[PDB]
Design a protein around this ligand. Sequence first.
Ligand SMILES: CO[C@]1(C(=O)O)C[C@H](O)[C@@H](NC(C)=O)[C@H]([C@H](O)[C@H](O)CO)O1
Ligand SMILES: CO[C@]1(C(=O)O)C[C@H](O)[C@@H](NC(C)=O)[C@H]([C@H](O)[C@H](O)CO)O1
Ligand SMILES: CO[C@]1(C(=O)O)C[C@H](O)[C@@H](NC(C)=O)[C@H]([C@H](O)[C@H](O)CO)O1
Ligand code: NAG
Ligand code: NAG
Ligand code: NAG
Ligand code: NAG
Ligand code: NAG
Ligand code: NAG
Ligand code: NAG
Ligand code: NAG
Ligand code: NAG
Lengths: 168, 168, 168, 314, 314, 314
Amino acid sequence: GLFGAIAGFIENGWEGLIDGWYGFRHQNAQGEGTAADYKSTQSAIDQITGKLNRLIEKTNQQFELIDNEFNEVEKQIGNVINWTRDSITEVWSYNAELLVAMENQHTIDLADSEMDKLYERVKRQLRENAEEDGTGCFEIFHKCDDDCMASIRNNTYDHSKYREEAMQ
Amino acid sequence: GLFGAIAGFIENGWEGLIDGWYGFRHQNAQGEGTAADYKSTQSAIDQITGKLNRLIEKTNQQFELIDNEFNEVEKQIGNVINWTRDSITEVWSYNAELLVAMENQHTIDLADSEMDKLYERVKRQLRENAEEDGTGCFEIFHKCDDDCMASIRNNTYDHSKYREEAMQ
Amino acid sequence: GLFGAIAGFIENGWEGLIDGWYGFRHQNAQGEGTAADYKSTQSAIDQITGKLNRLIEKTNQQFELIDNEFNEVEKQIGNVINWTRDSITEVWSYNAELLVAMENQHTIDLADSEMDKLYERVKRQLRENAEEDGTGCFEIFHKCDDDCMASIRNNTYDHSKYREEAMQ
Amino acid sequence: ICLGHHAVSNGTKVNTLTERGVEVVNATETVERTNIPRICSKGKRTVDLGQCGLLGTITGPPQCDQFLEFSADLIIERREGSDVCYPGKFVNEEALRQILRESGGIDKEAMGFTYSGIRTNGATSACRRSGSSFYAEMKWLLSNTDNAAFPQMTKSYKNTRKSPALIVWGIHHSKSTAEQTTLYGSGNKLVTVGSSNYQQSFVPSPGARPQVNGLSSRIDFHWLMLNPNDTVTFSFNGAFIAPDRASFLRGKSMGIQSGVQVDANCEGDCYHSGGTIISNLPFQNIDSRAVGKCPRYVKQRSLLLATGMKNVPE
Amino acid sequence: ICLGHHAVSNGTKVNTLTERGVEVVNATETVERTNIPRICSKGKRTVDLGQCGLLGTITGPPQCDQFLEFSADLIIERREGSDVCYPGKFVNEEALRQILRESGGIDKEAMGFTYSGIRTNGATSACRRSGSSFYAEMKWLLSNTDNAAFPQMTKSYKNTRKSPALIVWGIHHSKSTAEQTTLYGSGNKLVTVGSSNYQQSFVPSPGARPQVNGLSSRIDFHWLMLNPNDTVTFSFNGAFIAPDRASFLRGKSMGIQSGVQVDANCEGDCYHSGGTIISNLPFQNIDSRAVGKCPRYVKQRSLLLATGMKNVPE
Amino acid sequence: ICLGHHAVSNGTKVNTLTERGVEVVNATETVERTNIPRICSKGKRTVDLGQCGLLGTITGPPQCDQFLEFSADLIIERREGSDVCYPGKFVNEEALRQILRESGGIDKEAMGFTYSGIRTNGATSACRRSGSSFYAEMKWLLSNTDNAAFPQMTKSYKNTRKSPALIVWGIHHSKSTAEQTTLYGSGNKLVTVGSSNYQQSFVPSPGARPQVNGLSSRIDFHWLMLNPNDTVTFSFNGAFIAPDRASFLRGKSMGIQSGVQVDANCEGDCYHSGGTIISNLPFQNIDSRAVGKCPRYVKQRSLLLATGMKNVPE
Ligand SMILES: CO[C@]1(C(=O)O)C[C@H](O)[C@@H](NC(C)=O)[C@H]([C@H](O)[C@H](O)CO)O1
Ligand SMILES: CO[C@]1(C(=O)O)C[C@H](O)[C@@H](NC(C)=O)[C@H]([C@H](O)[C@H](O)CO)O1
Ligand SMILES: CO[C@]1(C(=O)O)C[C@H](O)[C@@H](NC(C)=O)[C@H]([C@H](O)[C@H](O)CO)O1
Ligand SMILES: *[C@@H]1O[C@H](CO)[C@@H](O)[C@H](O)[C@H]1NC(C)=O
Ligand SMILES: *[C@@H]1O[C@H](CO)[C@@H](O)[C@H](O)[C@H]1NC(C)=O
Ligand SMILES: *[C@@H]1O[C@H](CO)[C@@H](O)[C@H](O)[C@H]1NC(C)=O
Ligand SMILES: *[C@@H]1O[C@H](CO)[C@@H](O)[C@H](O)[C@H]1NC(C)=O
Ligand SMILES: *[C@@H]1O[C@H](CO)[C@@H](O)[C@H](O)[C@H]1NC(C)=O
Ligand SMILES: *[C@@H]1O[C@H](CO)[C@@H](O)[C@H](O)[C@H]1NC(C)=O
Ligand SMILES: *[C@@H]1O[C@H](CO)[C@@H](O)[C@H](O)[C@H]1NC(C)=O
Ligand SMILES: *[C@@H]1O[C@H](CO)[C@@H](O)[C@H](O)[C@H]1NC(C)=O
Ligand SMILES: *[C@@H]1O[C@H](CO)[C@@H](O)[C@H](O)[C@H]1NC(C)=O
């Protein structure tokens, strides 16, 4: 993707992450725990769902028969009719192929984007109280228990309260 | 958008910003003032204008009448003609819908991009003389009057001149 | 482009860079040397090549003659045939124009993206052992010879080994 | 603390602008391939013509007696349908079929032709209704006795209604010139038909044709649409199958050609000869000649649209 | 110091690939709906045929006397136009209309047919020019006196010019066989027309048709295009409306069918029956049968293209 | 240390969604303009009809004697081709050409008509094979002696094969009625043709036509396709050019119209009159009527696709 997170500096996805599209994996002193982020997940699904709502719509144009399967119509007019239909088919096969190719590129890139947005959001929450690994992890120099980690996930982390210790 | 500035970590736009698309809102000791950035604004408008120049062009293909509004042409050839025209209409209605949908996505995303480009440019100008809030604002630890702020906007800010104080 | 590297905060390309699409230009104490980065270059070419493989494909639909260059067919059926063909031509000329325009935008933007991915990767390798100029260059405060620079390019740079000196 | 994304053990491959066979966490099909082998007609007044050919509903061979004034939203033609009993054929037959397929059905009305000095009960063992009969909506006009001269005659009809009248007549080609003189008297025979927007003349051509239903003769059925307040005039001296009633179109409908059963328990709007395409997908790879409100036919059997992020397993 | 973007109190909703009704700061319409109820003809030699039917300019009924050699870039047909005076009809009429709509006008030239032994001044009260007259470009050939035999005759014309000649002739169907014998003598009548690329035979069919303009007879107008240096030959023995002049196409033009006035003060290139579409937009929702250089017709009434960033009010 | 990208001294300008003439490091053409002025036929059984017109292969004028049972994958019509020797023309000629272009060639078989009481060796100096001859696949049936009556006759043929039979017959229009009576006896002449799905009658029309190949007479060639197990019956009393053999289609092929030489050393699948389009590009600007497996024709002469990053020189 264009944003070099997913399949980029983040080495892999989590097959154990069954409760969201994106999430946090923390370790501190109590061990490790993993939880999903709802807002990022819901943003990507809402955008993908919008794409789906567009393509499964009704085209309320009725087309009627212009040739005959039981009693073939005159040859010349039949050749014009077959030629026209084959030309339209050429057009719709191309449009379908291009549409899906383009939309798949955009879907992958949008999911990549949502990860980077989550990553950058957290880094500034932690501000100077941490420096990032380079693999999607934040080396936290102050170190806090599970409620504080819980505070990073739901954006209740106050960088100042830990400010002096972390630089130190 | 894909770049998570506009409608992202920047909470809202400025309804008082009547002189540009993007801008700076500063406060120091003299109060607050707001000015627009010309280069970022002009980049987005130039790109949007280019899109406009493409879609309002001349198609110099002439089509002539092939049926008759006053004296209906023969039924079978008329049904082929109506069927073909309705098929082409199906194609152009889809193309128009898809074109506008795609271009609107790209227009929104490009405007989002121009904001992030402005934001990242300024952060490195200020270098280590500041740390960012997380809302699109730069907490400046050295603090300078209106001419210095003017120096950030027109990129005449020398980070070194204030270097020692800001870290301190 | 959307990522504000190429033709953005990076002022120009290197006409002397004949061995890759992206690269590093270093100076330390031994002078200057320039080398290309293979991974970023190969990523962009692989993506551009994929685009090429898609557009130069076979359409195995055969169309046969439906009018006559030597003995003109009847006028009315000939006018329907010319009208239909001109309509399809209108459609394919638009599709070709739009396809190339869209793909060129995406190609330029993807190349812009690969640069930013390279830039951001290196900055976190150097971590706090450096601060960035603002022009695509990293001011390295520790300073190392050509083998160490070689270590940045092939990602064998250990930030810790130089950690104390660089902050100092 | 580390940021990450989900992944799966076995993903789905899709195509993009730059790459073929990229694995994503989830995808969905856009091209419909599953067909329902029935004509899903729930909610729609349906007429299955069966052995009645669609054009026969206007002239009325025996197999169409039940369809002389049908009313429908959906019309189904069958391969075993026949427009005729006495061998013969319509001129510009497909144009008339397309008109009747969208007619919503037909309403018949007597045109009021009366005769004197001729026989009017021409019949055949090919149009059997408990013996020799004829097309129920037509009259086979012949001379009173064998070889008597068929008098030159003129019959006119004014469409006093508010929608166009479908007028059908026939030209009889006897197997020989000798047979034509017996039925209508000797000499060349001519029928001219004119309205405000129509004019055409017809002369019968007796001769041997291969035997169909025992007969080497044929009947040509011709038709025109008569506008409100316009008049049609027939001038003839023999070999003329006269119309007894005119047809009026009821409304709107759609016609299909199928070889599968009717199902009043499924509902559909896109039909082909093999059944019904019921789908929310924008494209189909089932039948390029499907009609109704249909997904666009495409040549591809499958086009997978990504619905999840790239799949990067461990 | 804070970075920001502009916003507005009331934005405009648009659609994207992922969302419907996203508010952006500004947008612009891509589908044209505003029509100008006139034929904008500024700068274009325009011919408004009015009561002259386009095909009448070749044969010359009275209402077309002013249009026998018109020259134009834009041709306007009107609903009140008539191609005929004596009731009758052209065979393959729409094909000839499409030829004449793009002809740029016509240039007439005498074909040089001379006669002896017949009358040449056939006239009717249906083609009135201060009394009974006929088509100005044709001659109604009849026998010298009532019921005299019309002699078998042959008339040939060579196109000595460098572009194809439009040749038109007519077949007269008298109201009765008795009337046909008076005008041309008794018996079957036949007209054969042949060129290097054309051959067709015609026999008149007398008979009653409903009365149009007082007549139950009709005239059939037939036509062909004669190539340079090619010759057309007419062989006939009666019931033949002979051409007096050939037509030559002037250049290029376009033809429309309208019910609105001409405006030499607006300029346009896309016309429909209701007027002119003047627009820089790539699409239109006004008339799918508009002709000229037109925006592409689409079924949507509106497609808003975003021209500003997303609108995020406070 | 500095990050950077490559650039070139002279780039290539392309277009994007937002800008025209952006310079990129490299680009490639998508629209094909280079034509090969030969019919690239390597690997394909090719038949160059030359002076034989495609329809002539069914009837057999002298210039087509070498093509009476041709077999081909690719059929090339030439501008100098003629379908006829005796002047005349096919009815619905283009439909038959489209059938034969995709036929893969024809296989002839005797239909088995025998005659008694007439002459069967009608000949002309227009179909010269070391003197007067005729169409090799037809027989010109005439009376035994001058002005003798041509007997009413019936000839039938059953298609006993498994694919449809192409049946062709002719109607002879002599230059005068006097000439028609000499060849076939006096009076009106009629030929009726009927099958299970076909019925049409024909009467000859003698008359002067301009002289082509010395003759003012013409022959009309008519055709039908006879289904397996179906029968065709001809009923005629003169002026009838009878078929001697039926044609059967061999398989599949494609037909083109060209004015350039055959090249068995280049291979192609997209042909137009000027040669062959050999290209991997998705679009072409060479000929909108090219046929085969072709790049899509577009109106643009060039569409440059970027294959490198933006070019930012120093
Ligand atoms: C040949 O037998 C019949 C038939 O049943 O078709 C007998 C019919 O009564 C007769 N009807 C009339 C009105 O003449 C019919 C007729 O002779 C032929 O069909 C004429 O081609 O023949
Ligand atoms: C019936 O009256 C007229 C007419 O004015 O149409 C009288 C015309 O002089 C006469 N002209 C000729 C050339 O015969 C015309 C004619 O008899 C009919 O139109 C023939 O159908 O009739
Ligand atoms: C006019 O000369 C010929 C010819 O060569 O065409 C002589 C032919 O033998 C003769 N053939 C027959 C079968 O009659 C032919 C014929 O008279 C005309 O072509 C009839 O239009 O004429
Ligand atoms: C039109 O298409 C069908 C196949 O879809 C084909 O069988 C038929 O022959 C075609 N019509 C003509 C006149 O060839
Ligand atoms: C073609 O379309 C118009 C409506 O746009 C319709 O009224 C007309 O009947 C159609 N032609 C035929 C032959 O049905
Ligand atoms: C169809 O197109 C060609 C030009 O491509 C033109 O010369 C020809 O006249 C057209 N057919 C008719 C019947 O006008
Ligand atoms: C995958 O996508 C399809 C269509 O969007 C959906 O019906 C299905 O439930 C999805 N599966 C999972 C596991 O999300
Ligand atoms: C037909 O004529 C009657 C008068 O008898 C009139 O009421 C009606 O409006 C007319 N209809 C049309 C379609 O002209
Ligand atoms: C909004 O866009 C349209 C079209 O681009 C333009 O004419 C109009 O002036 C714009 N309005 C503002 C306030 O920018
Ligand atoms: C027609 O013939 C004349 C000779 O009389 C010649 O000059 C002219 O070029 C010919 N035109 C064509 C189109 O063959
Ligand atoms: C530029 O692109 C074309 C097509 O991709 C390629 O054939 C050519 O070798 C390229 N040139 C360079 C210098 O890369
Ligand atoms: C034709 O009839 C023969 C019997 O003589 C039979 O074997 C064959 O299957 C039939 N063919 C068709 C197409 O009906």
